[PDB]
Amino acid sequence: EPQVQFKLVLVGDGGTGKTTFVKRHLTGEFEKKYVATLGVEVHPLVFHTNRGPIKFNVWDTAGLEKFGGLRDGYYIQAQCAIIMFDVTSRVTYKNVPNWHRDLVRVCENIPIVLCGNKVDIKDRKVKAKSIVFHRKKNLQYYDISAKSNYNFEKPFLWLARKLIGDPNLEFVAM
Amino acid sequence: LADHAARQLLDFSQKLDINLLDNVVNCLYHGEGAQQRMAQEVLTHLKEHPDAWTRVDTILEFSQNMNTKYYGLQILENVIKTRWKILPRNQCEGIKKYVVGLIIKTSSDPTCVEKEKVYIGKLNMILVQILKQEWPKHWPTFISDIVGASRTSESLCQNNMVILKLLSEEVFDFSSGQITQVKSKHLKDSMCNEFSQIFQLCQFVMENSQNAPLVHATLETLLRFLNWIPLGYIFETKLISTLIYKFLNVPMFRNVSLKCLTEIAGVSVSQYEEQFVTLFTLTMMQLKQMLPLNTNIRLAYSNGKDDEQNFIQNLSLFLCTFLKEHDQLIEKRLNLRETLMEALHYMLLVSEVEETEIFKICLEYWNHLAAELYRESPFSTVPPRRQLYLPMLFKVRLLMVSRMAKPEEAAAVENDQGEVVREFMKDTDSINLYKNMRETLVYLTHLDYVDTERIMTEKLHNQVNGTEWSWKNLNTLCWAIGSISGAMHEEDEKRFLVTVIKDLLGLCEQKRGKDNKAIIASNIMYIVGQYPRFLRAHWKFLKTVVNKLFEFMHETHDGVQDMACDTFIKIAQKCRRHFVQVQVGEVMPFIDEILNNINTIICDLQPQQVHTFYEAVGYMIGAQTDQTVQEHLIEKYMLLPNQVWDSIIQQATKNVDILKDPETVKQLGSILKTNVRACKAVGHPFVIQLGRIYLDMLNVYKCLSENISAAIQANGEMVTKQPLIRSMRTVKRETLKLISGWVSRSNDPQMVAENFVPPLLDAVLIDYQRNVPAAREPEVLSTMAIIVNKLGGHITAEIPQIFDAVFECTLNMINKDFEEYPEHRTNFFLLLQAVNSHCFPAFLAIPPTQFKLVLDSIIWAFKHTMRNVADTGLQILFTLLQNVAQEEAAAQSFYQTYFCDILQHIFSVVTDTSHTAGLTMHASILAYMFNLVEEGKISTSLNPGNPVNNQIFLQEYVANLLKSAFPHLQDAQVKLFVTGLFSLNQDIPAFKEHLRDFLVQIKEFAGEDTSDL
Ligand SMILES: Nc1nc2c(ncn2[C@@H]2O[C@H](COP(=O)(O)OP(=O)(O)OP(=O)(O)O)[C@@H](O)[C@H]2O)c(=O)[nH]1
Ligand SMILES: [Mg+2]
């Protein structure tokens, strides 16, 4: 059970829920406020698994342009990524190809998950039958909710399986 | 390391300390906390500095690491993106020669091509940015040059392929929001104009090169061109045959090629019938080589390396794309039947792979096939297309039954008070997967009822004999059996259901263990739940079922109680009319028997289960047409909650202090939950119950609200997390849900207004006002919102009193920052929007100063970055403008007072990169306002430019506003943009794009020129 750590890059339009998702994993709290991330904040996330601990260094990046910081410069040396959008905002899914573009132009062969967040909300605007971008880009897609705990660990599980190279990896508590 | 040391990089009078830049850059990728933030801050300031590009040479010449160098490149890219058009022509040419220079060198070094390929990538991007800015006009020989260097040298060719992919991408894929429409068009046309030269180079490399990496790049570049190039190049060359013979069957080229073939396959045109046929034919011939038809693709995928998994995905994409678009092409040709069935074979095999994303792709095809055959003909147990498919349609039916997804998705969710509640998710990926599977199976069932039943009969037999027995398997089958409800004729389905139920009951017998019986009974419950039509025809079965459900509400084995409650609500809504009419062979209607026995039915349920139980009975009571009868039903229905309620109220008159007792408070919450669920089902008629409790419910709300406030005064929001406080907030929230829930469903507005609205003032509204900020319940604002949208005219007279309680003290909580009290901001604007939509006269009755506070707050809303808040604010403003215009009387002094002011505020948000999600509304509001002037506003917008007509004054004011805020804009840019606000005020999409063009221009510096056409 040695300590492997991976640079994970978290990108998406602002207000998608990037920071709220990481904070709930880090502390269990759900943040209701929208406080834009300036530049990048790096938060270590440790998962315990049936084959020993895995640490993701989450580079939580800013989605508003005015707060971009070094933008694609933060992506150097990333080993995986999550792209987030908000299923209550079409603009976010439309800009997902742009996040994907900037990412793969810096890290070509890295496992990437795409997440549609906020599926708890009743007025869903990006319909499940519409989300197809990940197919041809060979991405995983998970519908998730930072608020309801829906598919909450799935993105990390997949990345962990793909990075450790064990299809049967599972997350354990302590 | 010290901030003042790292800031040394910003001096610009000293020579750059390369060692220091390396440490900072190193702090960026490897440092923690505050030191990394400082790096990030210093490096951002440096990257943005107008003169940073001067040192880029220094960086690339002396920097030890590639991190620093990459950063060097980021600086050069920014200068080309922001100030290429204001650099002197001589510095431009120098930058061109420096970049192609550096590209030649690094892509000529073989170490570089192996290791620093990210760096190479960035350099390529640098060049492309130069091309986007001035390629056709200031570099006319570019394409000829790139082609000539490419034929001159293999290393140049390989990289030049990347450059062309990037260019194609930037021009054809990512131009929106980065480049103006006119420049974008110009770029596309210029690339179209020189494509043949480029195509020839790709053809040359494909047909002749033995450089594997070069061929691969060429194919990666071709894949991007396929998106835009004229079809002639795709279909009237040997491209298809080249891809198939040369590349498709070579491991290292297999994925690119297949992806290319997929883009070709998706083209939908009548002109190239033959070439589509060849593409299918030839591809199938190669697939038979690399992937024999007897491969276990499920195992292959399970066990495969990364690019084998890719390969199988791409194969399902190719087959799905090709057949969805061109299956009739293969259908009509008799000598291709076997190859068509083979393609169906592959789809079936790939359908076994255990990965949702791939399954979904296969399912999209199965859904298409089933839809088509059912459009051709919907009849059962023979038309021409169905004829071709009949050999394998059983295998699709079998696939659907075997892999049917879970149809409902139940979760445990914590609310804002720390209760875990059982919710059901709506419209998720996995629910949409279920619905597609149902539709497929339902279509295929219509084509042959017997075949579906056959398959189900057999899966069931293998439950019974233990062959295929498991909780998972039985679930799947039962989900499937439920999925096809409605697809059979009523006579067939009765016979079918009876067999299914008998066999599962038999298996309930056969299997021992509480666990197993719970699983089997849950399935039975699920199925009968999905067949209301059967229940409606056979009253004796419906009665048995309901009673059986009542037995299950006393089994505390995990899951059984939830299933009984879930099934009971399904059946109650689907069959409600059956509970209220006297059934044949019956004394009373069933609802009477149910009501007389609630006390025994629910004695062992969990509170949440009780709530669902009452909801279910609510629907039955809802369906009783006669009013006086319904009242007696409700009286009896509410009897048990009313007892506990009354008793707690009596104790509370005796001593207000039990209202602090943990158990009393849980219980009040649980009683109110019951009232809310009952009202949700019953609707308007629940007025009789609401009225009984109204004044007592408001009084407990008021005490609890005061208790919460006082506790926060004494020990802050830490006291708020406390359990007791939580369960008091529950009561307030359920109280408000109950009021808003009934009001929404009321249809006697005069009544609601005179009868229920008045008492809210002292109990809720003034209580909110007197509450300490952190104790004020955001749901107060939402309830008023709901109330105002329902009453409208009936509540206009009371807005003054409502806003005196809530308008100012709320504003004051949310007007210091954009972030705090998020739910207050959301709900407060929803209330404003309600008043503005439904009670507009109230806004006219108030004095100008008061109305000014209202507009100020509307304006404050659309300046939010919480998109929901901003969008409501924008809609409010739009609705207000339209309302003001209704009366000529106030309209013109509104225009005179506020028109220009509103414009400036809209402009400040249109021109901020943070608000681009508002574009549609920004466009609508701006277009409406500009249109208002260009057709006629009677009063001068400027009081003393008595001469300038409003339209002339607006052009000068807006232009001046824009020159003011963006001084680097050239005069012609401002004029052209202002003119457009008038020209395009009838076309919101074009107006929208006009704004987007403007945002591009404000982020760059142009000099004494323009993109004309
Ligand atoms: N309903 C709902 N709201 C959510 C969910 N996840 C996050 N939110 C809310 O949406 C907002 C997202 O805020 P952040 O996480 O700060 O935004 P971000 O995506 O990190 O944005 P930037 O840092 O500006 O790029 C917050 O108000 C959250 O409370 C979710 O699953 N459901
Ligand atoms: Mg953030």
Residue numbers in the entry:
A (entry chain B): 6 to 179
B (entry chain A): 8 to 388, 402 to 1033
Give passages from the manuscript.
CRM1 (chromosomal region maintenance 1) is an essential nucleocytoplasmic transport receptor that mediates the nuclear export of a wide range of proteins and ribonucleoprotein complexes. CRM1-mediated transport is dependent on the cooperative binding of the small GTPase Ran in its GTP-bound form (RanGTP) and of the cargo protein to the export receptor, forming a trimeric complex that traverses the nuclear pore complex. The overall architecture of CRM1 consists of a ring-like structure that is composed of 21 HEAT repeats, each consisting of two antiparallel α-helices, A and B, connected via a short linker loop. The NES peptide contains four or five hydrophobic residues that bind specifically into five hydrophobic pockets (Φ0–Φ4) located in the cleft between HEAT repeats 11A and 12A.
Structural analysis of several inhibitor compounds bound to CRM1 revealed that their mechanism of action relies on the covalent modification of a critical cysteine residue (Cys528 in the human receptor) located in the nuclear export signal-binding cleft. This study presents the crystal structure of human CRM1, covalently modified by 2-mercaptoethanol on Cys528, in complex with RanGTP at 2.58 Å resolution. Recently, we conceived a crystallization approach that allowed us to gain structural insight into the cysteine-mediated covalent inhibition of human CRM1 by the classical nuclear export inhibitor LMB. However, when the same method was applied to crystallize a novel inhibitor compound known as C6, the obtained crystal structure revealed the unexpected covalent modification of Cys528 by BME, which became an obstacle in obtaining structural information on C6–CRM1 interactions. The observed shift corresponds to a Cys–BME conjugate, revealing the covalent modification of Cys528 by BME, known as a DeStreak modification. While the disulfide bond fits the electron-density map, the freely rotatable methyl hydroxy moiety was not visible in the density, indicating that it is most likely to be disordered. Ran is bound in the inner core of the CRM1 toroid and its binding is stabilized by the acidic loop, which is arranged in a seatbelt-like structure. The NES-binding cleft, with BME covalently bound to Cys528, is in an open conformation when compared with the unliganded cleft of ScCRM1 in complex with Ran and RanBP1 (Cα r.m.s.d. of 1.545 Å for the cleft residues 509–576 and the corresponding residues of ScCRM1). The reactivity of both the cysteine and BME is most probably induced due to the higher pH of the crystallization buffer.
